[PDB]
Design a protein around this ligand. Structure first.
Ligand SMILES: *[C@@H]1O[C@H](CO)[C@@H](O[C@@H]2O[C@H](CO)[C@@H](O[C@@H]3O[C@H](CO)[C@@H](O)[C@H](O)[C@@H]3O)[C@H](O)[C@H]2NC(C)=O)[C@H](O)[C@H]1NC(C)=O
Lengths: 215, 245
């Protein structure tokens, strides 16, 4: 139940270069070969790199990879729109379960539109839902480009891990992106804090909305 | 190379299910095989691996004692036996071929008819943990749910959903199964400023989505706003009034 940490997204203009890091531990990357997989939207993964820096026959020399210590790095040059996909690193060894792991995954975006900043709207639990002994906070995120966000939730000023469900960004009719995040609480958790916040990070800028039980 | 998974479906927690994967166009009994899963919208995760001959088996910590990989080399088939299923086992399950062949290193031939190779005398190659070919996967949804139309809750406009000028209001379409639902406002008469978001599959194995609409805050006292929710799988159509505060 360990993981190889990857950045959630990287992006570049067409023709440019991106790198994707893969940070692990002595037990996995430190002692083992690294492999890389490409997964295009709605498709099965495909092998990209094996034995740390080797390409299968169909893979162009625009893809290259390496490792140093406990970290691996994939590089993509001459980036083209067809390289948009999720990329996963991995290790696998027979010795120990902890050497059999995939990375958290990195979405590669090829920038073909201007940046667009998200509109964020946060709703508290309705009285009707609370009367049914449940509570859902709803954070809606729209009109952003590129199509990747991370969402964090806070109770007062403490981070909230449990109860969060967040969708993958989906293209809107105007070719910008939308997503949503839901925090499921008990009525007690909702009413026992001074506030809750949804924090949306897009291209390294974080914007935040807050709601409170006492309106 | 071709891999075709089968056996997936919707199943209740605590039950058992066996997935299968049929191999074609390569020498199945010369390669190790893997199962890998992907929960919806999440990352890849190793589940199980097995040597070309079915002797050596490896399983991920999250499934120890519950899932068992096996294979039948007389049928080009790989199996995953899944017992005591849990909601967090919901995922697309991929079958994948391992790269390294149990490659023959010495073989004799029919002396006159030497296009005919005789049973391999010596070979080597075991699992290397490189998945060079993948199937399209089979979906496993673990949930207690039967066909169920949604509950709808209003997302009321407030001073905290107003910037201006404009107010945002919506409806939360909660706990339905299966997809899809469609949403409109004021029976289709309100379309400007409407956005309906894709659903999330909750750990309870039911879906939820939201629809939000931006309107003049001056109108909140004069204009009625009603969200119309259709769920064809259950033949239900519900209308929910959304009003301040
Ligand atoms: C890389 O892996 C190693 C082990 O494979 C990790 O080092 C160990 O991390 C564990 C935490 O999971 C530590 O165990 C804890 O130790 C504390 C202090 O004694 C104790 O209070 C807890 O009950 C728990 O047992 C362990 O001390 C630590 N060190 C060693 C030598 O095992 C390491 O965190 C991993 N990550 C890296 C290195 O980035």
């Amino acid at each position: 139940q360990s993981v190889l940490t990857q950045p959630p997204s990287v992006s570049a203009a067409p023709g440019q270069k991106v790198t994707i890091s893969c940070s692990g531990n002595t037990s996995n990357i430190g002692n083992n070969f690294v492999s890389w997989y490409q997964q295009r939207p709605g498709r099965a993964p495909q092998l990209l790199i094996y034995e740390t820096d080797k390409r299968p026959s169909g893979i162009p020399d625009r893809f290259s990879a390496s490792k140093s210590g406990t970290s691996g790095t994939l590089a993509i040059t001459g980036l083209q729109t067809g390289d948009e996909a999720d990329y996963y690193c991995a290790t696998w060894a027979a010795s120990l379960s902890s050497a059999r792991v995939f990375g958290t995954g990195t979405k590669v975006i090829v920038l073909v539109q201007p940046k667009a900043n998200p509109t964020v709207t946060l709703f508290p639990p309705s009285s009707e839902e609370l009367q049914a002994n449940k509570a859902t906070l709803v954070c809606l995120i729209s009109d952003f480009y590129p199509g990747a966000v991370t969402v964090a939730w806070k109770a007062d000023s403490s981070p909230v891990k449990a109860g969060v469900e967040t969708t993958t960004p989906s293209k809107q009719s105007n070719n910008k992106y939308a997503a949503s995040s839901y925090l499921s609480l008990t009525p007690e958790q909702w009413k026992s804090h001074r506030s809750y916040s949804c924090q949306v990070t897009h291209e390294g800028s974080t914007v935040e909305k807050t709601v409170a039980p006492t309106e | 190379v071709q891999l075709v998974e089968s056996g997936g479906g919707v199943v209740q927690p605590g039950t058992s299910l066996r997935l299968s994967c049929a191999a074609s166009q390569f020498r199945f009994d010369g390669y190790g095989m893997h199962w890998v899963r992907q929960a919806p919208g999440k990352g890849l995760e190793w589940v199980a691996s097995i040597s070309h001959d079915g002797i050596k088996k490896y399983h991920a910590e999250k499934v120890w004692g519950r899932f068992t990989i096996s294979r039948d080399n007389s049928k080009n088939t790989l199996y995953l036996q899944m017992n005591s299923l849990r909601p967090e086992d919901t995922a697309l399950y991929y079958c994948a071929k391992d790269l390294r062949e149990d490659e023959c290193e010495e073989w004799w031939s029919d002396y006159y008819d030497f296009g005919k190779q005789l049973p391999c005398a010596k070979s080597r190659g075991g699992l290397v943990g490189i998945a060079d070919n993948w199937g399209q996967g089979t979906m496993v949804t673990v949930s207690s749910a039967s066909t169920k139309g949604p509950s709808v809750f209003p997302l009321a406009p407030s001073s905290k959903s107003t910037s201006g000028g404009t107010a945002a209001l919506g409806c939360l379409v909660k706990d339905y199964f299966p997809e899809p639902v469609t949403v409109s406002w004021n029976s289709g008469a309100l379309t400007s400023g409407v956005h309906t978001f894709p659903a999330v599959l909750q750990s309870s194995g039911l879906y939820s989505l939201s629809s939000v609409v931006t309107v003049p805050s001056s109108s909140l006292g004069t204009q009625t706003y009603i969200c119309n929710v259709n769920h064809k799988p259950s033949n239900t159509k519900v209308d929910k009034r959304v009003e301040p505060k």
